[PDB]
Amino acid sequence: PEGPELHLASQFVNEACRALVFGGCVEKSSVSRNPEVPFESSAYRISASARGKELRLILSPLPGAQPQQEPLALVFRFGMSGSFQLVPREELPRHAHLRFYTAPPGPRLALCFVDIRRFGRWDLGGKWQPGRGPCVLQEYQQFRENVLRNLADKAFDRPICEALLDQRFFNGIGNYLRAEILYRLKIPPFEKARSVLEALQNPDLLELCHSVPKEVVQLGGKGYGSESGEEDFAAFRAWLRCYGMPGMSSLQDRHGRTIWFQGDPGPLAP
DNA sequence: CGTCCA
DNA sequence: GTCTAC
DNA sequence: TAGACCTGGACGG
């Protein structure tokens, strides 16, 4: 999951929980090495917001819900396989590692953090990760300026395809988005990051770090769209013009992550 | 069955 | 896609 | 900074 998937998850939680009321403990699977979430309430509402590759849940108790309590905020990072699901209480998925339960009247549901590979993390109390830059979806101008102000950082010594994954400067961009963005401009993946951007002190690279993830958000789906699960997959796959597509060049970057591209790999390639 | 990949 | 122990 | 952290699915003999 990258920025778009975090954004769409945030929307899913707000649409799906708008008319729900949760109660009880926040239950966590025995196996999760993540922290227990110390929050019980007889009645409370879950809302969400996204920032790049992070999602913040707020647990907001209702007036007179016992015990008297302030709202609690968690922040989630999805890793490679993190998702939210609203599932009947009796049919929890495999790999449901954090669960919020509906209070009664009506059907016993469960909002689950489902994470097959358990790479996802949650932190108590609400703060975005110190160091992550502005969201490419929701803070374009702050994101765009944060980069152009700091091209003298060592991160931009790296090749462009490597720098595009630096969450200090491209919060929300992941492996598929760097493939899609660089393909749209035909920027060789192993051009020096600084050289590609020095030009910018017809959509440029930084517009596309925003407009391309936004194309994904507006397409919808990706586990959230009320579509048949593997229907969402087909549409997204149809959208991809470069990433793991037949007849595309492919290399490992200095961290051993597959960058996909057309034509010239660029001056700094293994 | 069993590696290779995300 | 980190995150932390090299 | 590069590998350890994980599971299920796709491909192959």
Residue numbers in the entry: 2 to 202, 222 to 290
Extract from the study:
Here, by integrating structural, computational, and biochemical investigations, we show that hNEIL1 uses a triage mechanism to achieve broad specificity and reduce futile repair of normal bases. This mechanism involves two mutually competing interaction states: an activated state that commits catalysis and BER, and a quarantine state that temporarily separates and prevents the flipped base from catalysis via auto-inhibition.
We next performed simulations for hNEIL1(K242)–dT, which prefers damage recognition using the activated state, to examine whether K242 would differentially influence the recognition of a normal dT. Surprisingly, we found that the two states are of similar stability, hinting that dT is more likely to undergo catalysis in the presence of hNEIL1(K242). Furthermore, our biochemical data demonstrate that over the course of 72 h, hNEIL1(K242) is capable of cleaving a significantly higher portion of dT than the edited form R242 (using a duplex DNA containing a mismatched T:C pair). In addition, such pre-catalysis checking mechanism also enabled cells to regulate the repair function of hNEIL1, as demonstrated by the RNA editing event that recodes the key residue at position 242: unedited hNEIL1(K242) is faster but riskier in damage repair, while edited hNEIL1(R242) is slower but safer.
